Every structure is written in structure tokens, then in C-alpha cells.
Design an enzyme around this catalytic site. Sequence first.
Site, PDB file in Angstrom:
ATOM      1  N   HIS A   1      -1.475 -14.040  14.550  1.00  0.00           N
ATOM      2  CA  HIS A   1      -1.528 -12.781  15.273  1.00  0.00           C
ATOM      3  C   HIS A   1      -2.047 -13.007  16.691  1.00  0.00           C
ATOM      4  CE1 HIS A   1      -1.448 -10.035  11.488  1.00  0.00           C
ATOM      5  NE2 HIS A   1      -0.225 -10.260  11.936  1.00  0.00           N
TER       6      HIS A   1
ATOM      7  N   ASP B   1       0.722  -1.264   0.000  1.00  0.00           N
ATOM      8  CA  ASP B   1       0.000   0.000   0.000  1.00  0.00           C
ATOM      9  C   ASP B   1       0.756   1.325   0.000  1.00  0.00           C
ATOM     10  OD1 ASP B   1       1.071  -0.328   2.516  1.00  0.00           O
ATOM     11  OD2 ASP B   1      -0.865  -0.342   3.532  1.00  0.00           O
TER      12      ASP B   1
ATOM     13  N   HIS C   1       8.693 -10.124  13.931  1.00  0.00           N
ATOM     14  CA  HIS C   1       7.269 -10.406  13.834  1.00  0.00           C
ATOM     15  C   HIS C   1       6.989 -11.271  12.626  1.00  0.00           C
ATOM     16  CE1 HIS C   1       2.870  -9.431  13.997  1.00  0.00           C
ATOM     17  NE2 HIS C   1       2.962  -9.683  12.704  1.00  0.00           N
ATOM     18  N   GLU C   2       7.441 -10.839  11.455  1.00  0.00           N
ATOM     19  CA  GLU C   2       7.184 -11.603  10.243  1.00  0.00           C
ATOM     20  C   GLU C   2       7.733 -13.030  10.280  1.00  0.00           C
ATOM     21  OE1 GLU C   2       5.014 -10.088   8.175  1.00  0.00           O
ATOM     22  OE2 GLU C   2       5.181  -8.404   9.543  1.00  0.00           O
TER      23      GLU C   2
ATOM     24  N   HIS D   1       5.646 -15.696  11.605  1.00  0.00           N
ATOM     25  CA  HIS D   1       4.662 -16.233  10.649  1.00  0.00           C
ATOM     26  C   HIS D   1       5.281 -17.320   9.797  1.00  0.00           C
ATOM     27  CE1 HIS D   1       1.498 -13.529  11.592  1.00  0.00           C
ATOM     28  NE2 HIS D   1       2.024 -12.442  11.069  1.00  0.00           N
TER      29      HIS D   1
HETATM   30 CA   LIG Z   1       2.831   0.526   3.368  1.00  0.00          CA
HETATM   31 ZN   LIG Z   2       1.624 -10.174  11.153  1.00  0.00          ZN
END
Ligand SMILES: [Ca+2]
Ligand SMILES: [Zn+2]
Lengths: 181, 168
Positions: free
Chosen positions: B129, B76, B119-120, B123
Site C-alpha cells: 500500500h 464483510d 490495485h489488487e 499486490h
Molecule cells: Ca465488503
Molecule cells: Zn490493497
Amino acid sequence: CTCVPPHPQTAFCNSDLVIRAKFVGTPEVAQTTLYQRYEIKMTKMYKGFQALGDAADIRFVYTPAMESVCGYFHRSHARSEEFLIAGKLQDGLLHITTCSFVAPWNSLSLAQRRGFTKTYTVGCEECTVFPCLSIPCKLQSGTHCLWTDQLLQGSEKGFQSRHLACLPREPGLCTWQSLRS
Amino acid sequence: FRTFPGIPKWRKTHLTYRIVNYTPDLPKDAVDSAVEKALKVWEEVTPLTFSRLYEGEADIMISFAVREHGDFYPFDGPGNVLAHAYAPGPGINGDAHFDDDEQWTKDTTGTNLFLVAAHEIGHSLGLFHSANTEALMYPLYHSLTDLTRFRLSQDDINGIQSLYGPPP
Ligand SMILES: [Ca+2]
Ligand SMILES: [Zn+2]
Ligand SMILES: [Ca+2]
Ligand SMILES: [Ca+2]
Ligand SMILES: [Zn+2]
């Protein structure tokens, strides 16, 4: 998926539709493995009249298939409960993600309600709220208001997010103004 | 899984990873520091091992991108979604992508690459989460002041260990 949530105002300006609705069904993969969709009952629509919707045109809110890749996860006990969903329109479909501003209407401050209903539009075309990620923040153009909540207390729902709005005041100048309600 | 590809956990302890490309934002050497320090966070709490590679396909393909970048989830632009990752499995699974449009920093003056990679990676290993705001696995980037005192939430420990067990 990790992200910095938007201030309600930015949530309102950048979104395509700011609907109010209730979550009718549990997530189900529609005609794509990539997105999961929730059947929703739309009550009030604060934005996106260039998509009608009245009370039942938008009946599904899409979001990625897995949390890791930003899918939104809804878990409430009472289905008649109302939420404020600020989302984008990919094709003619409402999309939401982990960051999308989704909060139950009743948890919303009187100020935030007033902003969604009337005042946020006022700051969209010119002003832009910028979230500070550190202590010295970052000086930006006069049209940017420094969102300095979280950094104090460590939250997504602080004071500026519950009572303030980034509205214009002078050419090239945007200001944090209070929207008492 | 049932519909989307991927497995609950890696069926091996010794994982391999690769930092595909680099972000201009930060000196190549600093990216290595952030990513590696990030991976270590999970090695300490499990019997898992991470070997860096520079050619071929590693399990965890770490990379920086902007807007459209291959997978079905374009980034984004500046703000909002800073990064995304995939669950254990073949191919694109386990991989972690990062939004270059963000200001990546190795310090408390921008979006801390370490914090996000940590964090990633959770996953890539099979974590989801968390609702516990104090848990690393909480999606909303909470940027902490002094990096030196960074600590894992018990919850993440109970989480990752319930999968890969504690260190032997
Ligand atoms: Ca972004
Ligand atoms: Zn996440
Ligand atoms: Ca992979
Ligand atoms: Ca950048
Ligand atoms: Zn991606």
C-alpha cells in the site's frame, strides 16, 4: 486490500468498541501467522462497555498479517500520541483493518469528538449513512443519508465527515444534521 | 516470506491468470474487459506478459466471493472492504478475490471493477500500500469521474519497475 472507509458515525455504530489508546509496540505475530498484533495502552473507552477494559483489559489490537489482505499499518513518531480506534471483537479480541477508522484524537474536529463522545449513538439504531460512489448517487430509503464528500475534492475527510451527522427527524426519515462544537 | 508464505517478486516474466467465476452484477464479457484492461496497466510499465487460461491452476486466480470463501479472511458484506489479494508465490499467492456484495460496474456508477482489479493485481505482483493518495496503490477507493483519462502515479511506476524493470 482496497476499501471505502466508513463515515465516523458508521464507524461508531458498527464497531464493537470505540476505544482511545496509544500504540506501545511494533507489530508482532502472536499465536497465529494470520494476524499481527500491536500492544496498546487504552485511555478512554467511548463504546463497548459489554467488554469492560477500564484502563488495561484491552492491551492488544489485532489486524491481518499482511497489508494486501487488509492489515493495518501504524507509523507515528511519538508513542504517547492518542488515537481513536473503532473496532470489532472477534472472540474477545479487538480487530482493526485497513478501513477501520483510526485517526489521531488531536486531528479530530471538535464536532467529531462530540459525536464520538455523545451524538453518534443517537443515529445508530435507525439511521444509516450511505457513501455515494458516483454523481447520480442512488436514492435509498428515507433512513439513509447520502455521504457525498470525496466526490468533491477527492478525500476521506471532507465536510460531512468533519461536521455532519445522520440523525433521525421523522418516522422513516433520517437527516444530515450539524453537530456544531 | 519469513513466517507467512510468499515471495518478494515472481521469478519469471510471463505470468498466467484465470478468472475463476463470474459476478452476476456484470455481463461475463464486461468482467473480461475490466480484468484485462486492469492487467495491461502493469504490462505497459514492465516487461511482464499475461496469458489468460480457462483450466488448470494459473498464477493469479481471480474470483468473486461473499462472506466465507476459503481463505482466512471472510469478506464483510456490502461496503467497507471491497477486495483483497495475495503476494507473489505458490498456491493461493498472487490470487485476487472480490466482494460480490458490492455493486460491480464497468462505469462511474458503482465500484469500478477495473480500478479495484488494477490495485489488487499490484499486490499479486509484489506491491504494497502507498501513502501517496494519488497513487493507485493507495487502498482507499477514490473513484474518478472520466475513466478515459486514468493514469498511473509516477510512484507506482517507480515501485513496480524497481522490481521487474522497465519494458525492453
Ligand atoms: Ca465488503
Ligand atoms: Zn490493497
Ligand atoms: Ca496462485
Ligand atoms: Ca455485488
Ligand atoms: Zn479471500
